[PDB]
Amino acid sequence: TTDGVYRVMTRGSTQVGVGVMQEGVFHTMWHVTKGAALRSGEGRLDPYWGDVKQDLVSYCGPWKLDAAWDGLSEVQLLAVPPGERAKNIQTLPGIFKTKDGDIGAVALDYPAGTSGSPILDKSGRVIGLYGNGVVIGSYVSAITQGKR
Amino acid sequence: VDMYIERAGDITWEKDAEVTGNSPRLDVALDESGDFSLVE
Numbered sequence: 001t002t003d004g005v006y007r008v009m010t011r012g013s014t015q016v017g018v019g020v021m022q023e024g025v026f027h028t029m030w031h032v033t034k035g036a037a038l039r040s041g042e043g044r045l046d047p048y049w050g051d052v053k054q055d056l057v058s059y060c061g062p063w064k065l066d067a068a069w070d071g072l073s074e075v076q077l078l079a080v081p082p083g084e085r086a087k088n089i090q091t092l093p094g095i096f097k098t099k100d101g102d103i104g105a106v107a108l109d110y111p112a113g114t115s116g117s118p119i120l121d122k123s124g125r126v127i128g129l130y131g132n133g134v135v136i137g138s139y140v141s142a143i144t145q146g147k148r
Numbered sequence: 149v150d151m152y153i154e155r156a157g158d159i160t161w162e163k164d165a166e167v168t169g170n171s172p173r174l175d176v177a178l179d180e181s182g183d184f185s186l187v188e
């Protein structure tokens with residue numbers, strides 16, 4: 001239940017994604033778990049809220065992450081690659097321009113098991129999750145943030 | 149299928165992080181299934 005970034009594993013074992021524990025709620029991308037219950041040691045985390053269009057899901061409570069990219073500053077992807085320790089990658093986001101407004105986007109292309117890794121602002125707040133995006137050969141991920 | 153989680157670290161900014169990646173500006177659409185696509 002400790003705050004932090006977590007691997008999402010399935011069973012040999014394989015890493016299917018990453019998520020964020022904050023304020024007792026686990027946050028990841030819907031396509032990582034498809035809403036399945038999660039084991040945490042001896043305990044079970046049940047889905048609480050999910051949305052396929054946003055590609056997000058929260059466990060044990062409502063979505064808690066609400067910081068947003070300021071549109072100017074560099075950010076850090078806190079990646080948890082399969083088989084490697086958590087590591088930070090700094091970048092200046094580009095922009096997804098949509099009919100409903102702009103979304104920050106990071107032009108970083110890492111293994112699929114990193115989906116759900118948090119993107120951070122300079123204060124260490126999670127401004128969204130990595131792993132839903134488009135191809136331009138290079139993958140570009142939206143900075144996907146939910147609603148608190 | 150046992151899906152489970154393992155803690156991997158704190159949520160922190162790292163001062164000495166590697167820096168990379170460009171900053172593209174893209175017109176995209178988001179459909180009902182959550183899939184982004186390019187728009188012209």
Ligand SMILES: Oc1nc2ccccc2cc1CNC[C@H](O)c1ccc(F)cc1F
Pocket residue numbers: 077078079080081084087088089110111114
């Ligand atoms: O540099 C290398 N050196 C390699 C040397 C031999 C074989 C494979 C090699 C792969 C690489 C690239 N590794 C990237 C790293 O795994 C990572 C870092 C940040 C992040 F956000 C997500 C990530 F997956």
